[PDB]
C-alpha cells in the first residue's frame, strides 16, 4: 500500500507504531507494523 497525507511538522513523530496524539489516535493509527515511513517537508507547495 501507499498512504499519502499531509501532517504538521511537529506531528511527523506521531506517525509511528504505538504512539498517541491528535493525529495518531483520531486520524491515522498504525498497528503496534512492517513498512517504511517517509516524510519530506513541503512548504513551497503547501504554505501560502
Amino acid at each position: 500500500y501507499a498512504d499519502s497525507f499531509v501532517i504538521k511538522g511537529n506531528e511527523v513523530s506521531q506517525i509511528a507504531p504505538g504512539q498517541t496524539g491528535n493525529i495518531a489516535d483520531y486520524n491515522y493509527k498504525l498497528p503496534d507494523f512492517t513498512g517504511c515511513v517517509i516524510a519530506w517537508n513541503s512548504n513551497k507547495l503547501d504554505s501560502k
Binding site: P17, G18, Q19, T20, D32
Partner: protein, 49 residues
C-alpha cells in the same frame, strides 16, 4: 505506551518463567530422593516386616 509496556513486560515474563523453571527443576530433584527413600521403605516392609 504500548511499545514501552511490551519492553518492560517481557522482563516480567522472562523473570517469572525462570522463576517457575527453577521451581520445577528442584521438585524433580527432590522427588528423585523421595522415590529413593520410598523404594527403601518398601524393601524394609517386605524384608523386615
Amino acid at each position: 505506551d504500548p511499545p514501552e509496556a511490551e519492553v518492560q513486560i517481557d522482563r516480567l515474563i522472562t523473570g517469572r518463567l525462570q522463576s517457575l523453571q527453577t521451581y520445577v527443576t528442584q521438585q524433580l530433584i527432590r522427588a528423585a530422593e523421595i522415590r529413593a527413600s520410598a523404594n527403601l521403605a518398601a524393601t524394609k516392609m517386605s524384608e523386615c516386616v
